[PDB]
Amino acid sequence: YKGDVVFRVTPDRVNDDGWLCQRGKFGLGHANDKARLTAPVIKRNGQFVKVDWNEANLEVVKRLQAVVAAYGKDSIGVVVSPRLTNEELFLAGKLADAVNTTIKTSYSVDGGSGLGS
Amino acid sequence: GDAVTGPKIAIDAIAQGKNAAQVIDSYLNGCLVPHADSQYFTQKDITAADLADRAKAPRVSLTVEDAEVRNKSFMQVAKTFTEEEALRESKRCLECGCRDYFECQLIKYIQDYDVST
Ligand SMILES: Cc1cc2nc3c(=O)[nH]c(=O)nc-3n(C[C@H](O)[C@H](O)[C@H](O)COP(=O)(O)OP(=O)(O)OC[C@H]3O[C@@H](n4cnc5c(N)ncnc54)[C@H](O)[C@@H]3O)c2cc1C
Numbered sequence: 001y002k003g004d005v006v007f008r009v010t011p012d013r014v015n016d017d018g019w020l021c022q023r024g025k026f027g028l029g030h031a032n033d034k035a036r037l038t039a040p041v042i043k044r045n046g047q048f049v050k051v052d053w054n055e056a057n058l059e060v061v062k063r064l065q066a067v068v069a070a071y072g073k074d075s076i077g078v079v080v081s082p083r084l085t086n087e088e089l090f091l092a093g094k095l096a097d098a099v100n101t102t103i104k105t106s107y108s109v110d111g112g113s114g115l116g117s
Numbered sequence: 118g119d120a121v122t123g124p125k126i127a128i129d130a131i132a133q134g135k136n137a138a139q140v141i142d143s144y145l146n147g148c149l150v151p152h153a154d155s156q157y158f159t160q161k162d163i164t165a166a167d168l169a170d171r172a173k174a175p176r177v178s179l180t181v182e183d184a185e186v187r188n189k190s191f192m193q194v195a196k197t198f199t200e201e202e203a204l205r206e207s208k209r210c211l212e213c214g215c216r217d218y219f220e221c222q223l224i225k226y227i228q229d230y231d232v233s234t
């Protein structure tokens with residue numbers, strides 16, 4: 001990289017075998033995408049309006065609390081992507097525990113490979 | 118505070134806290150003095166006809182969010198004044214009090230000798 005622009009990706013020939021494929025060689029261009037979001041947006045009157053981080057945090061926490069209060073236990077599902085790091089997934093599990101739900105899942109994992117049973 | 122006067126508004130609690138701070142500070146110097154109200158000259162003969170030569174200027178109304186988006190969010194229902202609104206509202210005061218209060222010598226002796234006004 002050079003500053004805030006990722007220019008290329010090369011294999012690591014010292015710590016591993018030093019091979020890559022197309023998704024690893026050329027797949028980091030989405031970091032340079034101009035279509036990436038920058039600020040959180042809240043839907044009011046059918047239009048997305050930009051908000052601050054504090055307003056977004058308060059909105060999501062209060063809306064999850066409203067769902068729990070109206071409908072009780074296990075009314076919230078947490079669907080994650082398996083591309084996040086272990087600490088992100090741990091905090092997502094903690095967030096699922098805090099809003100009183102046991103439905104934590106992912107469309108990509110979809111229940112495991114069945115070797116655990 | 119509310120521990121003594123019972124449930125009231127918040128500025129009552131603030132007033133009690135400040136008065137108690139003054140009393141405690143006097144006590145810590147070795148001479149406890151209780152808090153007493155001051156005596157002022159007041160006018161009760163002012164009627165609407167005595168102010169009939171004053172021009173009329175409408176109040177700066179408060180910008181309140183629509184009730185469609187208020188019922189779902191914990192967002193603020195009103196906005197703080199802008200500088201133009203604040204200047205426009207503050208320039209409307211009638212200046213009821215005496216301008217000489219902080220240098221008048223009559224009220225000084227009236228309050229020193231505890232004369233009823
Ligand atoms: C629902 C509600 C809405 C209100 N709305 C308004 C309003 O719109 N406008 C307005 O002017 N006023 C309003 N008030 C009134 C205002 O909130 C109170 O009158 C004011 O805050 C009084 O404050 P206080 O210092 O007397 O005590 P509080 O602020 O009530 O409490 C002081 C603190 O003492 C602590 N405390 C209590 N017991 C102990 C203990 N044993 N040891 C240690 N700490 C302790 C508590 O944790 C608390 O934080 C409202 C009150 C309520 C209940």
Ligand code: SF4
Pocket residue numbers: 209210211212213214
């Ligand atoms: S001096 Fe006080 S009471 Fe008189 S017009 Fe101004 S704000 Fe109102």
